[PDB]
Structure formats: C-alpha cells, structure tokens
Amino acid sequence: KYRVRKNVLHLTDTEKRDFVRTVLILKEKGIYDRYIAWHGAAGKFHTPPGSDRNAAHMSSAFLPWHREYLLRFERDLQSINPEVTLPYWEWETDAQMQDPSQSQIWSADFMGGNGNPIKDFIVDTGPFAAGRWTTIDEQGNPSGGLKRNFGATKEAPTLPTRDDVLNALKITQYDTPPWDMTSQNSFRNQLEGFINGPQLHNRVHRWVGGQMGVVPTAPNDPVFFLHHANVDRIWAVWQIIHRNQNYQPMKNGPFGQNFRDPMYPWNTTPEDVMNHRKLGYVYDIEL
C-alpha cells in the first residue's frame, strides 16, 4: 500500500527516464529474459493436458498469474532502483482518439512508435528499437528485433473503450464453469476478452501487433507490462466493487486453477495474490 503505481500519462520526464533505464538494465543482466521464458512456458503448460486451458491463459488463473508475474517483475526493478514502480497503460482512454498511435506512451523517450512498413514492421524508434533491444523467438532463440503494427487487423481495428471496461465491471461472478474460453457471465473471461472476442485484453494484444500479437513472444515488448498493469488495475477495481465476491473455482476445478493451487511455473497460489494491497502496492486512482 506504500508503492504507488501511476498512469503512464501521469508520469514525469524523470520518471519515464528512470523506468526505461531500469528495464534496459534488467535486460542487460539477463533477468528480463526469464520473464519472457516464464510466460512462454506457462502458455504451453495445459491444465489438464489435452485441454485448451493453460497456467496463464484461457482459464481462471489468468488474472492471478499475471498479477504474480508483474509483482516479481516490479521487485526486480526496485532491486536496481527502489524508487521505480510499474506504470500502467490506460488504453481505454487512448481509444477515445481516432488514432491512438498519437498517444504519449509511443513517444521516442518511452516505448517508441509504430513499426516500419519498410522493415517488415520492425520498430526503429525509441529505446527498444532494433539495435538497442534484442528479442527472442518462440523457441528461445534471437529473432532480430521488436515489431509493431497498430490496428492492421480486421478482428481488432480499434482499442477497447471505457464503456467496454465499465460493462465488464458489471459482472458479478469472477468466473464460471467450465473455467475456460466459453465461460459465460464471467468477469475473468470478459476481461480476458473471449466473449465475442477479441475484446479488452485480447484486443489490445491484437491491436499492437508484432510480438504482442502472439502469446509466447508478447513480453518481448516492454509495453506488455504496462498493458497488464492496466488489466491488473481493472481487476483490482472489480475486487473493490464486489468486495463480497471472491475467486473461482475454490475447488473441483482443474489443477492449477483452484484457489489454493500452485500456479506454474511457480508455487504461488491465487490466494497469495488475491489482495494487491497485501502485496505492497496500490494504484494511483485508489488515492
């Protein structure tokens, strides 16, 4: 509750400079690659084997998994600089624009801009451009740099709207059986974006394009953490609103999806991260 997580647009020049630097330091030390691998490993860990659910996606563990994912990442950031916290990308407001690519987040001093159509949509601006930022493929091998391609998809030509977020907050149940892609009246599945998908979370990924468009390689783009910090923020809001609601399933769900099951690749359970304030951080809007 002492660490404040701010909106990217509400950041100071010095703050944006310290975050980027810290990320570059984590990358240089080899720590950043662990998060790309963790995410890719979880996406291939099905619960149970044979089903389309995995440890991190298309299931109830989606939200607590990524919350633990961000928590570990933020702790690594502060090991370098204790004053640095993980910002979030409030994409629902950027959607109000006719061209979200003009947002301050895509400036050369933070995340960098859109991909270059002359270089197969390779990002050539910002601190994460090809030449300063190395990317790895689905196999853990070097891939030749970051790619982006804003709204060039038919399924996701736009970013999710504030109404879309608000409509998701209307849901009462955290999740519903069979705890997967087809869960109805489920806040989790709604926020993830499979209900008339791609929506919300899934839509943001498809909108950015490049590595962000594919599960095993999405964390290659630093904006991935800013995006999921917003998803985590939206979840935290839901938990505040429906304070009487709790996680599901509590039991009788697939192993790795229940309230007290370890989340691969970790031993962390959804219960351990159910209360974000207990984790030692808070979002600016809560103040």
Ligand X SMILES: O=C(c1ccc([N+](=O)[O-])cc1[N+](=O)[O-])N1CCN(Cc2ccc(F)cc2)CC1
Provide the annotated binding site for Zn(2+): 10, 13, 39, 46, 52, 57, 66, 68, 92, 109, 120, 163, 201, 205, 228, 242, 276-277, 284
Q: Which residue has the tokens 């109830």?
A: 60
- Phi (first) and psi of residue 217, to 5 degrees: -120, 0
Which partner, ligand X, Cu ion, its own copies, none, binds residue 129 by CB below 5 to 8 Å per kind? none
User: Residue 121, Cα to own-chain centre: how many angstroms?
Assistant: 22
User: Which stretch, 49-57, 70-78, 139-147, 233-241, contacts Cu ion (CB under 5 A)?
Assistant: 49-57
Q: Which is nearer to ligand X, 22 or 202 (by Cβ)?
A: 202
Among residues 1, 4, 10, 48, the one that binds its own copies under rule CB under 8 A: 48
Q: Which is nearer to Cu ion, 56 or 223 (by Cβ)?
A: 56
Kindly tell me the burial class for residue 124, based on how many C-beta atoms sit within 10 Å of its own C-beta (0-12, 13-18, 19 or more): middle
User: Residue 269, Cα to own-chain centre: how many angstroms?
Assistant: 18
CA distances from 204 to 44, 59, 101, 239 (A): 21, 18, 13, 22
Three-state secondary-structure class, residue 283: strand
Annotated binding site: 10, 13, 39, 46, 52, 57, 66, 68, 92, 109, 120, 163, 201, 205, 228, 242, 276-277, 284
Q: Which is nearer to ligand X, 40 or 254 (by Cβ)?
A: 40
Q: Which is nearer to its own copies, 40 or 113 (by Cβ)?
A: 40
Name the helix (H) or strand (E) containing 15: helix 13-29
Spatial distance between the Cα atoms of 247 and 245, rounded to a whole number of angstroms: 7
Exposure of 102 in the CB half-sphere (CA atoms within 13 A): 5
Contact between 14 and its own copies per CB under 8 A? no
User: Which stretch, 22-30, 85-93, 164-172, 191-199, contacts ligand X (CB under 6 A)?
Assistant: 191-199
Among residues 228, 230, 239, 247, the one that binds ligand X under rule CB under 6 A: 228
Contact between 213 and ligand X per CB under 6 A? yes
Name the helix (H) or strand (E) containing 272: none
Within 111-170, the residues that bind its own copies by CB under 8 A are 134, 136, 139-142
Q: Which two tokens stand for residue 1?
A: 């509750």
